[PDB]
Amino acid sequence: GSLTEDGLSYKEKFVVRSYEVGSNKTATVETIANLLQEVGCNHAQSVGFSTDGFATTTTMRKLHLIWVTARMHIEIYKYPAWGDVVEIETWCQSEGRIGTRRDWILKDSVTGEVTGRATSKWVMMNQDTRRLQKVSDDVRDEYLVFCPQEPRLAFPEENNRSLKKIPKLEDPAQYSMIGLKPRRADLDMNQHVNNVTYIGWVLESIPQEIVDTHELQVITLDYRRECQQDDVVDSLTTTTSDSQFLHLLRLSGDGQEINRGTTLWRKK
Amino acid sequence: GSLTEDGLSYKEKFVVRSYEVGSNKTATVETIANLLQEVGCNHAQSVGFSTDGFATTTTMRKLHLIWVTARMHIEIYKYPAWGDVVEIETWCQSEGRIGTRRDWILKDSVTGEVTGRATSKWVMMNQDTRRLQKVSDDVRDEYLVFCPQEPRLAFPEENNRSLKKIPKLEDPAQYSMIGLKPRRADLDMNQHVNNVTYIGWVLESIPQEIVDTHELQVITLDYRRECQQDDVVDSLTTTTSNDSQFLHLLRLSGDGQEINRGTTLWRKK
Numbered sequence: 375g376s377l378t379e380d381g382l383s384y385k386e387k388f389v390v391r392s393y394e395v396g397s398n399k400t401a402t403v404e405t406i407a408n409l410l411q412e413v414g415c416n417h418a419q420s421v422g423f424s425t426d427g428f429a430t431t432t433t434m435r436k437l438h439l440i441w442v443t444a445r446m447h448i449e450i451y452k453y454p455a456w457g458d459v460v461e462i463e464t465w466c467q468s469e470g471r472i473g474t475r476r477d478w479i480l481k482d483s484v485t486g487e488v489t490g491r492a493t494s495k496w497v498m499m500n501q502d503t504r505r506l507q508k509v510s511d512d513v514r515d516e517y518l519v520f521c522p523q524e525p526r527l528a529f530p531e532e533n534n535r536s537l538k539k540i541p542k543l544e545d546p547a548q549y550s551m552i553g554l555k556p557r558r559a560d561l562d563m564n565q566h567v568n569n570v571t572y573i574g575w576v577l578e579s580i581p582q583e584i585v586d587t588h589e590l591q592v593i594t595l596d597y598r599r600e601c602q603q604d605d606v607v608d609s610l611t612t613t614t615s616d617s618q619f620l621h622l623l624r625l626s627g628d629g630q631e632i633n634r635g636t637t638l639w640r641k642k
Numbered sequence: 643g644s645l646t647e648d649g650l651s652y653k654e655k656f657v658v659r660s661y662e663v664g665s666n667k668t669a670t671v672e673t674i675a676n677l678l679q680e681v682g683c684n685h686a687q688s689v690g691f692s693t694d695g696f697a698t699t700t701t702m703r704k705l706h707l708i709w710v711t712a713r714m715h716i717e718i719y720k721y722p723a724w725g726d727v728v729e730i731e732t733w734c735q736s737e738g739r740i741g742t743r744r745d746w747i748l749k750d751s752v753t754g755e756v757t758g759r760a761t762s763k764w765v766m767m768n769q770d771t772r773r774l775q776k777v778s779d780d781v782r783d784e785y786l787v788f789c790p791q792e793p794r795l796a797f798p799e800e801n802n803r804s805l806k807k808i809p810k811l812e813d814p815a816q817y818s819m820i821g822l823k824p825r826r827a828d829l830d831m832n833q834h835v836n837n838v839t840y841i842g843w844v845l846e847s848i849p850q851e852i853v854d855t856h857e858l859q860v861i862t863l864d865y866r867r868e869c870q871q872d873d874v875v876d877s878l879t880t881t882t883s884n885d886s887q888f889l890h891l892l893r894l895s896g897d898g899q900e901i902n903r904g905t906t907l908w909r910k911k
């Protein structure tokens with residue numbers, strides 16, 4: 375991979391692996407989400423930020439501040455097959471005092487056609503107290519020279535799906551998968567649950583018949599609180615409709631919300 | 643990746659990814675085991691066998707026969723760090739009528755040093771009845787031209803760890819992790835649990851204090867029966883031992899049917 379000519383975005387190619395594909399012989403959405411994290415990490419490394427997934431500055435490090443994902447939105451038009459080469463381009467852009475955004479564009483390396491798009495919203499948090507805070511002018515000014523100055527959005531369209539508010543699923547859920555728990559493979563280098571694991575957990579409560587007859591086109595996931603290494607999660611889903619679903623992940627005991635989301639599926 | 647000059651082995655390089663590393667900033671043993679499967683699959687593709695992980699011939703496909711893993715043995719001297727390039731070489735060799743063997747050697751691409759090695763034993767099974775059978779002379783003769791004709795072993799030493807018999811853990815286990823179940827990410831393209839998931843499940847019952855103070859050097863795992871997509875597994879471990887050694891058992895949560903047994907060897911950091 376490498377920074378592009380202008381130094382304001384990063385590109386990397388990946389060859390889809392045998393164990394990365396699902397029943398359609400194409401990459402799963404969790405494989406795509408892991409590749410988006412990998413290219414984001416390589417971009418932060420190339421310009422001197424931390425490589426732990428938080429992309430912090432030296433000033434954020436003294437204040438014990440990190441960036442944490444608030445929302446992930448992914449739209450896939452075509453999943454790459456085993457052995458195919460996919461090129462992913464990524465960039466960031468600050469969003470005032472609210473937080474920051476990392477966007478991605480996925481292309482088929484042979485045709486050059488856009489096969490998918492993603493956008494993520496991040497907020498600043500103290501790593502110890504877990505308290506959110508608005509971004510200071512000093513921190514935002516430090517990142518400006520690593521981002522495009524004019525707006526550059528993976529989802530430019532008006533009233534597009536990526537910014538829609540997600541409601542809270544009401545009990546009883548139509549479908550559920552209970553007692554989900556992370557294993558060591560679900561943890562990152564800092565022993566926290568990888569953000570992609572929550573996408574897997576949301577998808578566990580979609581009935582197998584939908585997975586067998588449809589393809590996932592869009593997923594929007596809000597992150598509210600972490601699942602700790604010793605927590606247990608219930609995944610709930612209700613049809614709201616293409617087939618569309620509303621999702622909720624909550625801690626198995628007390629029912630504390632950890633994530634909410636929506637998915638849109640196209641019949642094969 | 644590519645077949646080597648003589649066409650009897652396959653090599654492929656991999657750059658270690660951010661999400662593939664553990665608490666030491668080096669690749670986990672499950673990441674290494676997934677790379678071993680990937681290079682095995684690319685080798686089978688390059689010479690015309692199936693690419694579903696079973697590496698079958700046309701004759702095997704007619705008889706509804708597949709190769710299934712009976713044992714996996716991995717020894718790691720150094721785990722590659724994030725961003726490092728590791729080169730893996732793999733080859734197969736038939737083992738008479740018993741089954742076949744796939745071996746691997748892992749090297750650091752910059753130094754050329756051997757950083758690990760692995761060997762796996764496979765048996766032939768009818769896909770539908772799940773009945774094992776000996777390998778016919780016709781099938782073994784079909785694979786001979788794709789293997790070295792003189793012995794080539796990743797573990798040549800006498801009485802080496804890779805061929806040792808593993809005993810059955812007796813209750814009560816010293817440690818356990820109960821109620822493990824696969825999710826869709828644990829399944830392969832044919833909706834079966836990926837062999838690497840069982841390595842993860844064995845390791846779940848090792849106490850966190852061992853993982854925090856030791857490095858896994860050797861793992862030997864026997865595969866007896868599959869975990870189905872709707873099954874639930876219990877992982878049991880007992881210390882048998884500077885090095886720490888453990889005996890492992892995976893069994894179905896309800897009736898206690900054995901699915902795997904294994905041993906691990908760990909060295910203090």
Ligand SMILES: Nc1ccc2oc(=O)ccc2c1
Binds near residue numbers: 417418423475517521
């Ligand atoms: N606001 C902001 C935050 C994190 C960033 O990390 C990068 O790797 C490049 C740009 C960037 C911008």
Ligand SMILES: Nc1ccc2oc(=O)ccc2c1
Binds near residue numbers: 685689691697743
């Ligand atoms: N006996 C045996 C079985 C499977 C094999 O698959 C390969 O990809 C190359 C050689 C080989 C040999």
